[PDB]
Amino acid sequence: MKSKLPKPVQDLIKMIFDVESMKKAMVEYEIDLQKMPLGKLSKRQIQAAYSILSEVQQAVSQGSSDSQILDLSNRFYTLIPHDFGMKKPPLLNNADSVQAKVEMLDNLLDIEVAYSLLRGGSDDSSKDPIDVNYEKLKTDIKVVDRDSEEAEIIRKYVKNTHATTHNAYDLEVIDIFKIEREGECQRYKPFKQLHNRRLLWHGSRTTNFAGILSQGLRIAPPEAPVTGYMFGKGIYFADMVSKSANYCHTSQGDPIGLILLGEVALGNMYELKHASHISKLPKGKHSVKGLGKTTPDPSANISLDGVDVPLGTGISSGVNDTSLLYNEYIVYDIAQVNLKYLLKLKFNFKT
Amino acid sequence: MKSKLPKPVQDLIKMIFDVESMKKAMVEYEIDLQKMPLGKLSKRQIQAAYSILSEVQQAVSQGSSDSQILDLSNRFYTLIPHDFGMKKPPLLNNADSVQAKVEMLDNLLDIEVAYSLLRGGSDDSSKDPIDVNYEKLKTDIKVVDRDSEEAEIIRKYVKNTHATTHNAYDLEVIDIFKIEREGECQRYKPFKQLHNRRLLWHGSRTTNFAGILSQGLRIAPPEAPVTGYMFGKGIYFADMVSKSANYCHTSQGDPIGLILLGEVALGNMYELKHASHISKLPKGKHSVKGLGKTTPDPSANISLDGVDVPLGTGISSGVNDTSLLYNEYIVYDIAQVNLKYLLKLKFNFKT
Ligand SMILES: CN(C)CCC=C1c2ccccc2CCc2ccccc21
C-alpha cells in the first residue's frame, strides 16, 4: 500500500525528514563531513561544545586570560571538525562569534534529534515511509481549508506584518496546518486563563521541525551559555512575520520556509530595550518584551480563541532608544507555549 | 595669608585640582590636546559624543559591516579628535570598543567640572589658593583621628577585603576623611531607615573627585548608551576594597589614589549573575546586587551608624555559573547614596 494522508501533509513530511537537507545544513556551516559524518554526530558532543562556549563566556568576564580563549576556540574546531578550505576559521573571542555558534549548535541538536527519530522506533517495510514518520512526530496535522476565516485572518496577519526594511523577499501562504502535539493541551492548562495571551510567530530552519513537533519548543540546555542568546535561556517569538521569517534562514536554493503560530502565556512583560542575559525572572514578571521602534498597530488588534492577534500595520511606537528595530516576546518556561498553526511559505526574492 | 586647614586636607585639595594630572589623564585616553585641549572642553561636546556612541551601539548589535560602520566610527573621532601616533583611525566595532570609549567620556565629563570649577569663581591674591578651592567643593571635609574606633573599623575593613586576584599590588592607608556634602543628608531622608543599608567601596581616578564632591555621585546622562556598562546606567559599588581601588587607575608613575565609603540603601535587591543592560528596574526592586563568586563572611558583619558594615574575610559564596568574581552593587537613584568617608591610599606595587 501507499500513504492515504492529505497531499500537502505528505510533502511536509518529506521536507523535515530530509537527509540531503541535513547534510547540506552541516556544509552551510562549513563542516568536514569526512571526519564528522551525519552518523557520528551525537547529543553530548554538542553539550561539550556548549561547555566550551560557556567556558569562553566566563573567560571574558572573569578576568583577562586571552591566551586560554584561543586554546578553547581552537579546541572547539577540534571538537567539531570544520573544512574551510584555505580560509581562516573565525576566531571565537567575543559576544558576536559566541552568539553565532550557539545558533548553529541549537540547530545541530535538532538535526541529531531528527536523525535519531528517523533511526528511532520500528522497522515496518509493508507501510509507507510517510505514515511511519507521521506517527513518529506525535502530532495530528490537519490541512486548514483556505476558505476558513481563520485562514483569512492568518493571511491578514502575514500580509500586513511584513516589515518594509526586510526588502530582500516577499511572502505568500502555500500551506497552513492545524497541528496538535500530544500532551501540550494538558501542559498549557495552568497558563490557559493567565491574562495577556497573544498568538505569535516562531521561525526556524526547515529540518528542525522534526524535533520541534515531536518535542516542542525548548529552552537551551544547562550546558549552553546565557550570553549566547540576547535575552537568555528562554523561547523567542515575534509579532512581525518578517522577523521570524529571517530565522527560517531561507536561501536561493531553499526558498520554501516553515513558520509557526503559537499561543504564548505572557502576562506581565518585563519591558526592556537592550540586551539582558538571564536564566530566570523576578518574582512577578512571567515574560520579557524587547520593545522596538516599529510595531503592529494596537487599534487593529482582535480576538480569535479569546487570544490577542495584533495584525495591524507596522507603525512607529514613540520608542525613545532601543537596540531592536522590531518587537519580540520571550517566556522562560516551556509549558507557557501552546503551538497552533504551521505555515509553509514561499520566499520570492527581489532583483 | 596662609591656610588655616590641616596639612592632609591641603595636599588632598592640591592633588585632585592638579591640572597637570587632568592633562595627563586625557592623554591616557588617546585624546589630542592640540585639537581637543583641556580648555576647549564643554558639556554638550561630550554629550554629542554619547549620542554617536549610542548610534554605534545599534550599528554594532545589528552586525553592520566594516564598510558601513566606518562612517559612524569617524563621526565619533570627528567630535572628539584623538592622537593616534601615525596610525589610521582605529575602527570602533564591538562591545569593548564602546565600553572603553564610554568609561572615557565619564571622566571627560568629570574632568570638565574640575576645570569648570577652577575657572568659574572669584580670584583673590590675599586669600589662599587652597581655601578658595575648598569653598568650591561644597564639602565639609574633616580629618579622622587615627585612634577613634571608626578609624580602626575602616583599617580592618580595608585590611581584610583585599582580594587575592588583585595581589599584584598591596594597599596601605595614608589619610582618612569624614566628609559631608551640603544637602546630601536632605536627599537621604526618605531612604535613611530603609532595610538593608550598607557601607561600600567606590574608587575613581584621582582627577574625577573634584566633580564627585561638587555634584555628588552621578549616573550617566540621557544621551549615553546603556550597553557601555555591565548593568546599564546607574551608580556602581563594591564590598571588596581592592576591586574598587583598581578603578583609581594608579601605576608606578602615580602610586597615590583616592577612594570613597558611601552608605547605600540597597533594600530589595535584584540579584544577577550576568550582563544586564537596563535603565529601569522591575517593580518592587530598589538596587541591584551582582552575585559574586566571592563574598565577605556573612557572620563577620557589624553595625556602625546602624548601617551594615561588611568587613569579613574572603570566602566562596557558593554560586554556579556567574560572571562576577566579587559582589558589585548598583543603585539606580542618586538619592540612595550618602557619602561618609574618603581615604587616601598608597598603592605599594610589586614592580
Ligand atoms: C566618577 N564616578 C561616577 C565613577 C563611577 C564608579 C566606577 C566604579 C568604581 C568602583 C567600582 C565599580 C565602578 C563601576 C565602573 C566604573 C567604570 C569607570 C569609571 C568609574 C567606575
Author numbering:
A (entry chain A), B (entry chain B): 0 to 350
Which sentences did the original study use to describe this structure?
Poly (ADP-ribose) polymerase-1 (PARP1) is a highly conserved enzyme focused on the self-repair of cellular DNA damage, participating in several biological processes including apoptosis, chromosome stability, gene amplification, transcriptional regulation and cell division. When DNA damage occurs, PARP1 senses and binds to the site of Single-strand breaks (SSBs) and becomes catalytically activated. Inhibition of PARP1 will lead to the accumulation of SSBs and stalling of DNA repair machinery, finally resulting in double-strand breaks (DSBs). Previous studies have been reported that inhibition of PARP1 leads to synthetic lethality in some BRCA1/2 mutant cancers (including ovarian and breast cancer), which could be specifically targeted by PARP1 inhibitors.
Numbers of PARP inhibitors have been reported over the past several years, such as Olaparib, Rucaparib, BMN 673, Niraparib and Iniparib. These previous work had well described that PARP inhibitors occupy the nicotinamide pocket in the NAD+ binding site of PARP1, forming key hydrogen bonds and π-π interactions. Firstly, we used virtual screening of chemical libraries that based upon Drugbank and ZINC databases, searching for novel leading compounds with distinctive skeleton. Top500 hits were selected by LibDock protocol in the first step. Subsequently, Top100 (PA-1 ~ PA-100) hits were further determined by CDOCKER protocol and selected for co-crystallization screening. To explore how to modify the leading compound, we constructed the structure-based pharmacophore including ten reported co-crystal structures of PARP inhibitors. Among these features, four of them were found as common in these complexes, including A1 (hydrogen bond acceptor), D1 (hydrogen bond donor), AR1 (ring aromatic) and H1 (hydrophobic). Therefore, we can further modify the leading compound by increasing the length of carbon chain; increasing substituent containing hydrogen bond donor and changing of aromatic skeleton. In this study, we have described the discovery and identification of a potent and highly effective PARP1 inhibitor OL-1 (compound 33e) with a new chemical skeleton. This compound was designed and synthesized based upon co-crystallization studies of a hit compound PA-10.
